[PDB]
Design brief:
The chain has 129 residues and is mainly alpha-helical. The chain contains four helices and three strands; from the N terminus they run ααβββαα. The chain has one domain: Lysozyme, CATH 1.10.530. Strands 1-2-3 form a three-stranded antiparallel beta sheet. The longest helix has 12 residues. Monomer. This is Lysozyme C.
Length: 129
Amino acid sequence: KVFGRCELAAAMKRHGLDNYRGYSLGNWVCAAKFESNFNTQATNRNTDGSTDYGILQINSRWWCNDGRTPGSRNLCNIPCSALLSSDITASVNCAKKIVSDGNGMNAWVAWRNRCKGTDVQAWIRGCRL
């Protein structure tokens, strides 16, 4: 599923991500834009053999099991395929664990490099929420 900007904002809010760990909703929408272009089915292989999955490009090196990432962990206790669902519940639950892990939203390199410090409220500008 390819979300619209406000459609995603709304869904993230409904699942409790707005201001989770102090990160406003525009930060989450901005991260999703540059990680996946709002596409729940996005997958990308990393040089090291792990893969990133879903709207927030969660990595099999630590967070989910895809069965082909030797020496990896599954800290969200989910199959990586569940992060490709049209329903974002599993990606949200896992993202809450990642952003609590110590480095906040810097765990998402595209958030650091393209969202951090910018006018992230523009991502929710105009949305009925």
